[PDB]
Amino acid sequence: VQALFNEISADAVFVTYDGQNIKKYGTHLDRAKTAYIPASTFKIANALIGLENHKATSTEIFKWDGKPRFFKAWDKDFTLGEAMQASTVPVYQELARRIGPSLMQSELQRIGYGNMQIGTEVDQFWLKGPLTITPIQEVKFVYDLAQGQLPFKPEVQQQVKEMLYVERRGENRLYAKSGWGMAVDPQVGWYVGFVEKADGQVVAFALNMQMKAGDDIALRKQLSLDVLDKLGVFHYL
Ligand SMILES: *C(=O)[C@@H]([C@@H]1NC(C(=O)O)=C(S[C@@H]2CN[C@H](C(=O)N(C)C)C2)[C@@H]1C)[C@@H](C)O
Numbered sequence: 375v376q377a378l379f380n381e382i383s384a385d386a387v388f389v390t391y392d393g394q395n396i397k398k399y400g401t402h403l404d405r406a407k408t409a410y411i412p413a414s415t416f417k418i419a420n421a422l423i424g425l426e427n428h429k430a431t432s433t434e435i436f437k438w439d440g441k442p443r444f445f446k447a448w449d450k451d452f453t454l455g456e457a458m459q460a461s462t463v464p465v466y467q468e469l470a471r472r473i474g475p476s477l478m479q480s481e482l483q484r485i486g487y488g489n490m491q492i493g494t495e496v497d498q499f500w501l502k503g504p505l506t507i508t509p510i511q512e513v514k515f516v517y518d519l520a521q522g523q524l525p526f527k528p529e530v531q532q533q534v535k536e537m538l539y540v541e542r543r544g545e546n547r548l549y550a551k552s553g554w555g556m557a558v559d560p561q562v563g564w565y566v567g568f569v570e571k572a573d574g575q576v577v578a579f580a581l582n583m584q585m586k587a588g589d590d591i592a593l594r595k596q597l598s599l600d601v602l603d604k605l606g607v608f609h610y611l
Contacts, residue, residue: 375399375606376580378597386583391513392575399601403452405582407488409506412561413555414461416489416500418566420469421454421537423481425530429472430454432532432533436465455537461552467497485525487515502557509582512566513527517578520549520568538567545572552594554585561585565594569608 379386379401387405390397398406412419416545424430448462457465470478475496488507492499499505507515508595518524522531541548550567565581581598602608 375601378600378604382593384523384583384597386581386597387509389509389513389580389582390605390607391510391517391578396510396513399605400583401437405466406509409508410564410582410584410609411558412488412500412505412507412512412553413564414553415507415512415551415563415564415566416463416505416553417458417466418519418534418538418551419482419485419487420466420473420500422519422526422530423473423478424454424469425482425533426526427473427477430469432537436468456487458537458551459540463501470497487511497533501555509566509580512582513578513580516551516566516568516580517576520570520578529557538603540567542552542577543608545605546570546608548608550595550598554591554594556585556587561587563589563594565598569602571607579607 385402387398387400387403390405432454435451435453436457443449443464447460448464449485452460452465454489478496479492482492488505488511491504493504496560518532519535522528535549538549538551540550547570549583550565553564555562558575563583563585568576568578570576579602581597603610
């Protein structure tokens with residue numbers, strides 16, 4: 375499992391949490407206590423805050439305004455859940471603006487998300503700082519989401535869980551969110567989520583790694599699923 379990790383020159387940590395114990399794997403374990411920008415993984419918290427504070431619904435269609443976005447794949451209409459899986463920044467920036475800086479700040483503090491700092495710009499703080507979060511905090515946040523244990527209404531947590539539903543493999547279910555922060559140095563790669571196993575156990579996970587411009591986009595998920603197979607959490611079908 376260690377051999378898997380250093381087949382790349384990836385500098386990387388993989389964290390698991392089962393509600394009592396944190397386990398760490400990879401090439402650079404100190405990464406798990408290290409704080410990084412959440413990038414696209416912040417969409418989980420943005421969705422939760424938005425639904426809880428009645429700023430959006432899980433059925434609302436955020437329409438494209440016709441102005442070309444950073445990626446052409448984002449030049450369409452999205453619900454929050456579709457935007458979650460496509461990582462559609464401008465949709466979640468619209469949501470963040472509906473929320474507003476003081477409510478966003480008060481809410482991230484209330485729920486104890488990372489360092490709880492947003493600064494002045496309500497649509498940039500998760501992409502360039504000053505908000506940072508450790509992979510351990512990330513694994514515990516999504517674990518709590520999985521259990522309905524976050525400080526949000528139960529139906530809100532359920533809605534955001536379904537936004538993260540990415541694979542069914544028998545009676546096992548995978549929930550995940552990827553992230554690639556490119557506007558910081560060094561670049562940060564995330565793949566965070568949980569597996570709801572057929573036996574009833576949930577295991578939460580977080581991949582956190584250094585990235586750079588060459589890197590293939592699928593590598594984070596591949597790695598994660600690789601490790602989860604090796605650990606026995608989510609076997610390849
Ligand atoms: C979030 O961290 C950023 C997005 N995160 C990801 C990602 O996790 O893969 C991407 S990749 C981007 C969106 N999908 C485009 C694509 O796959 N095609 C056009 C085929 C590439 C983003 C970098 C967000 C902050 O931008």
